[PDB]
Amino acid sequence: PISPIETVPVKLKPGMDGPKVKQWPLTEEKIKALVEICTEMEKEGKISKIGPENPYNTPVFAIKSTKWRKLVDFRELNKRTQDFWEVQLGIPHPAGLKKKKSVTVLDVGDAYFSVPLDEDFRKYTAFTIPSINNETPGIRYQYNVLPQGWKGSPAIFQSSMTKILEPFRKQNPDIVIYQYMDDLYVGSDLEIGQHRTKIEELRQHLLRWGLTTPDKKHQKEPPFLWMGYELHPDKWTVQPIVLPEKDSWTVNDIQKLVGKLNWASQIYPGIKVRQLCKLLRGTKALTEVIPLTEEAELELAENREILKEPVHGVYYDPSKDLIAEIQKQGQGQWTYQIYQEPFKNLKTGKYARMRGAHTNDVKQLTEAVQKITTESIVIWGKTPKFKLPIQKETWETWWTEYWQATWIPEWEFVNTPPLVKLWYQLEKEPIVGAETFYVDGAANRETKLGKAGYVTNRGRQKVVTLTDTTNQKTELQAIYLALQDSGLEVNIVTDSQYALGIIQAQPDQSESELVNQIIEQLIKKEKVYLAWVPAHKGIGGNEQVDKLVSAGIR
Amino acid sequence: IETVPVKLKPGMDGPKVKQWPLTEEKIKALVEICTEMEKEGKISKIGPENPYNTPVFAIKKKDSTKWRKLVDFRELNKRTQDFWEVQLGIPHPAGLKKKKSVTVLDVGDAYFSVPLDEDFRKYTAFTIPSINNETPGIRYQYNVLPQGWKGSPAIFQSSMTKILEPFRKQNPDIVIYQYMDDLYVGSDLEIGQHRTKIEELRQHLLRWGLTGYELHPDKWTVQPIVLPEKDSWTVNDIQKLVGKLNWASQIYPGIKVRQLCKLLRGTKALTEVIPLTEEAELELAENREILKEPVHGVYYDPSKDLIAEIQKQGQGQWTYQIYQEPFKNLKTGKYARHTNDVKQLTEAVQKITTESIVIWGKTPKFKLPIQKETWETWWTEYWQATWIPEWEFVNTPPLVKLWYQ
Ligand SMILES: NC(=O)c1[nH]c2ccc(Br)cc2c1S(=O)(=O)N1CCCC1
Incomplete structure (x- = not known):
């Protein structure tokens, strides 16, 4: 049965014509298997014979556990077909569903093959069964229904099923139906008897629209395995997670584990992945063995402990x-x-x-x-x-x-x-009785070497040499020097907006180990005031550490 | 009525902008609004064969309990800029910013009486999402000039002119400017007289279907860079001052720091009070003067x-x-x-x-x-x-x- 549902108009992308790909010659057994498959499909309205007048073509193949299957390669037609609206914009999260008294799933039989294809488009679905040893013509058909593997099928199917369900929904707003590919999940808060009764009324309203569905005795019992989940009418969990027992772990084994642990994390609280993930950094082939760091071993053990014993979530x-x-x-x-x-x-x-x-x-x-x-x-x-x-x-x-x-x-x-x-906190004002450090860094772009240093108002000075740096690194190296040599309470004056911005945001962790060393120092102080001055002005202490630090490095 | 043909920007497709997630009450407000528009023929449901999308939201709109649908046509507006801007551009009046009083009036309802070119409708597609994606999104497109699309005021221009014609003739000195869904009305009248003319304007719009916010552009003055005025200046205070002055320049020509910096020679403590040599005071003196005035050389x-x-x-x-x-x-x-x-x-x-x-x-x-x-x-x-x-x-x-503090 093909649905009596109105058809969706379809178009080829602008400035393109239908596909015209030649048919490869096939073995005799393949031609034969194809002749049987098609005559059966034609005797059901799914496809129709056409002539050498239609000029489009799409390859057909035939593959075999010992029954033949027809394979139409729509790659080329797909590239010429218009884009459609997305099938699903997201999938529901089980946590967002409502608890249900009774719930059933109806799988739609021969889904695609039950919805008609736009009359004006069928022509581009043309395929040819070749003649024996290509000598002679070929049997030529075109589709009357939505083809498997065609770009517009999924969306046109779902839209048709949406149009068909509306009537029912209006008359039964207290009933939930969720459309997923070719399945239909039906939920209600009805007593088993009246639910079974509303299913039947549904199964028949669908039947009237050219869509078949399994009968009672044939429709599955909860828990429903869906999208990696296990659904009961009163609770939900993720599908069964088995963390293998392995003596040796390859990159491919760690990646799979990490994905299972990430999936379980939606309902098992406290799942951790960072140490296991650190191991996948750098990486060799999917086949290469990775020794598990200690940390990675503790994390695995901790995860294993969290996972023994099921945990389920409740609904909304x-x-x-x-x-x-x-x-x-x-x-x-x-x-x-x-x-x-x-x-x-x-x-x-x-x-x-x-x-x-x-x-x-x-x-x-x-x-x-x-x-x-x-x-x-x-x-x-x-x-x-x-x-x-x-x-x-x-x-x-x-x-x-x-x-x-x-x-x-x-x-x-x-x-x-x-x-x-x-x-730690930075002062809003300069500290009285605190030594002032004027800091500065300089780096040569050609040689990559530089110097970091300071001059204080209380006599001191220092310049250190660095070898594979950048200006940014020198400026941060300079600030660190001043914090090492200063003792609690200090005033630091830099000309680096870069280092200022970083410190003013009160970092406690950084990608830069130098930044981490500065932080560890900042937490040790009593008071730190940090200020900025423009570089290359006459500004006191600044002009002095600048000349000190520039020497040989610009 | 007839429709004005509309084209996109050559070898440019329609918008395919994702619908952001909405709360339960905004989804319900939209379902309600859209069900009513559809009933009236303003928009129609669409099929999977329309792959376009423009985001949609719900807003309250100043001192109103009612929900307003708000369509984000930022992308479509970008893909139609030759139409609304070059082909059918709306001149902006320079006298508007000069008026003592400017009133803003929402004139968006005007658009739904004009039909939209059939071949362009598809590009106005939008979606009402469901919570948790439990049902499919409700898909629509427009049949009339939509609000928020810069093509709507461009197209309705001629009708707006007919509509405002008598009022403009009677009030030669009032400036009316349309921008998107609003009308900007400026005058130099005394306030009660300005509000009176506005109500009169509402009466004219009311004869054609259409049915505010109050500015004073002429009162839009300065917002300089200010310098501190003080007794007892610190080393720390001076540095902050040159830092700000140093930055003030680049935008302001004339700013000088030599004298301010000369004050700072050596390697001084931050908490060191440093008496401003009169040479200096004359510097931020002229700088303070520089800063109080306008840019010079900057034009739109x-x-x-x-x-x-x-x-x-x-x-x-x-x-x-x-x-x-x-x-x-x-x-x-x-x-x-x-x-x-x-x-x-x-x-x-x-x-x-x-x-x-x-x-x-x-x-x-x-x-x-x-x-x-x-x-x-x-x-x-x-x-x-x-x-x-x-x-x-x-x-x-x-x-x-x-x-900028
Ligand atoms: N819409 C719902 O609130 C809902 N709630 C449920 C609770 C348990 C089960 Br089993 C199915 C359900 C369903 S459902 O059957 O529609 N559907 C299950 C897959 C996602 C939604």
Whole structure:
């Protein structure tokens, strides 16, 4: 049965004609297998014979566990076909679904082959069964329905199924139907008897539209394995995750493990991947063995422990608020959970992202909130109420003084260490009784060598030589010198906007080990005031460290 | 009625811009709005064979409880710039910025009485998404001039002129400028008299279907770079002063620092009070004078885009500069304030855009001191305007903020 549904008009891309690819000669057994397949398809309205008048062509092949299959290579027609609207804009997350009393899945029989193809387009679907040893013509057909492997099939199928379902939906708004490829998931809160009854009424409304579906006795029982998930009407989990037992790990084994651990992270809280991931850095062939670092071994063990014993999530109650909680798991690692009723998770997740080169826990926490806020809008249409391991004073102090704008949705502090905090502060004013260090760095672009140094108001001076640097590196090297030689309380004056910008943002972690050394020093001080002056002016101490540091390096 | 043919920019396709995720209440407001437009024939449902897309949102719109649908035609506007700008461009009047009073009126309803060329409709496609992607998006395209598309005012131009004709004849000294979905009405009348003429204008629009915001461009003055005035100057204070002066120059010609720097010779402590040799005081003396005046040499170039930079100053304050060439400031200003950073930045942007429309007839491309994603999720929460400017996301330079405080 081909559906009586109206047809979707189709077009070739602008300034293009249909495909005209010649048919390769086939073996006799293949021609034969194809003649049988087509006569059957023709005797069902799926395809139709045409002549040598239509000028387009698409290759056909035949392949074989011992039954023949027809293969049409639509590559060329696909390149000439217009673009369509995307089939799915995203897939639902199970955490966002509502709990259901009864749920069934109907798989649509011969999906594509039940929807008609635009009359004016059929012509470009022309294929030829060749004659024996090519001597002679060939049998020529064209499609009447949506072809397997054709660009427009998926979208046209789904649109047709959407048009066909509307009538039913209106008369049964208390019923959910989700369209996925050629399956239909049907959910209701009805008693088993009236659900079975509404299915049948559905199965028959579809039948009237040229679409077949399995009957009771033939339709599967929950749990439904779908998209890597296992769905029960009252709960959800990810499909069974087996972490292999291996004596030797190859890159391909670590990549697969990492992907399974990332997948499990949606519901198993605390899953970690950073040490395992560090191992995939650099990398050789997919086949090369990688010794597991210690760290990697502890992470695996910790993950293994989290994974023994199933964990399931609950579904969404739209009448209740969503609560999201976040914990710092370590350096750059964040983990979160979302619930509506304390401790019954709808879902879990982790966030790691390094945003920039130098950063702090205040900025990372706030980026994690943003990532969760976005995900929430997607899954539930609303933002959650957050519980953060950061004191309210800490947050407002930071957001208030920083130069970038921000806004978090409603949140409350929660005492779950480690608590988020700033590790040092720069003074707003120069320290009285503090030695002033005027710093500077210089680097030669040709030789790549440079010098970093300082001159203080209290007599001191120093210049150090560096060999494979950059100006930026010298300027940071200069600041570090001043922090090493100064003792608590110091005033540092630099001409580097670059180094200033970095330090003013109160970094606690960096990609640069030099930056990390500066940070470790900054946390040790009592008071640090840092200021900037334009280079190449007469500015006191500056003009002096500049000449000192320029010597031989410009 | 007949339709004006519309073409894209040669070898240029339609927009295929992703629909951002919307909250439950904005999705429901849109479903409601769109169901009513469709019933009235303004838009129709479309098939999978339309691969185009333009984003859509819902806004409240100044002191109104009602939801307004807002279509983001930024991309389509880019793909149709020869049509609305060269083919059917709307002249911008230079006298507008001079009027004492400018009133902004929303005239977008005018558009739905005009039909859109059948062969262009497909490019106006947009989608209403569902939560969790549990159902397919509701797909539509327009049958009439859409709001937010710069082709609509260009096409409706002739009818607008017929409509405003008697009022303009009767009031030779009032300037009326259309920009996108709004009308800008300026006069030099006393305020009650200005408001009276505005109500009269509303009566004329009302005879043709159509059915405000109050500026004072003439009162749009300065916003210099200010220098500190003080007794007892520190080494630290002097450095900060030359730093700011040094930066002031590059934009301002004449700024001098030698004397200020001469004050700083040797390797001094920051907390060292240093008496200003009169030679110096005469320097920031003339600099202070330099800074109080305008640029000189900077003019608007109509063939160039306008850029706007904004700095978060703290405690409700924001600074901004509009220019085409960096350092060649056409305008500078400030904006001051339940208000978060996003809500305040959102109002500053709309405020800067409106002045820019009034002054030059075009919107600036904004460089926003905010994380993209934060802006993306929050902006429509406080957006009230019917247009949307172009924007980028930047990280404010450390000193730039202090130099504009
Ligand atoms: N729309 C829903 O809220 C919904 N809720 C469910 C709960 C459990 C099961 Br099993 C299926 C469901 C469904 S469903 O059947 O539509 N569909 C399952 C795949 C994604 C949505």
